[model samples]
Target: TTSQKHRDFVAEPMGEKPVGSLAGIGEVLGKKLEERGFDKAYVVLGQFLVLKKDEDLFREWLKDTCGANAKQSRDCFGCLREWCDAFL
Candidate 1:
């Protein structure tokens, strides 16, 4: 099933959305990403683009960045990918 935040994120313009707004990025993962200077969703989007939106690269980066598991990494990547499709 798609996540609420995933739907919400992909449907909106890129703004000052918090990292927590990304699917699979809960408080803990958000905090970790924020600590790595990705305090905003757009910051993460920068990384997504830097990776050329590659799924494996992004998933691995997410795991290394925030300890995201398989589903968490998948959900986060999916969120970014769809957001790019609609708004990039």
Candidate 2:
């Protein structure tokens, strides 16, 4: 189920909330990300943009970083992609 919170989040600029705000990133993955220095969604987006929005690369990175399954990674990636398309 798509949470309204998720939709509201992606509908605006990610001004500096924790990475956990992104879809599919729960408390566990969020903490892992914070430990790895990706405390904000924009930090992850920087890496995504650096990779030129390559789906395969981003998905692999997400999986390797936090053990995100394919669907979870894709949902997170899609949220970021749509946000970028709308605001970036």
What does each candidate score in C-alpha RMSD? 0.7, 1.4
Record all residue pairs in model 1 with backbone atoms less than 3 Å apart, i.e. clashing.
none
CA deviation > 4 Å runs, candidate 2 = none
- Candidate 1, residues 24-50, lDDT tens digits: the string is 999999999999999999999999999
> What TM-score should be assigned to candidate 1?
0.96
Worst 10 residues of 2 by lDDT: 1-10
lDDT (tens digit, per residue) of candidate 2 on 14-88: 998789999878898888888889999999899889989999999899999988898778888888888889989
Clashes of each: 0, 0
Give each model's whole-structure lDDT: 0.92, 0.86
Using Cα atoms with residue i matched to residue i, what is each candidate's TM-score against the true structure? 0.96, 0.91
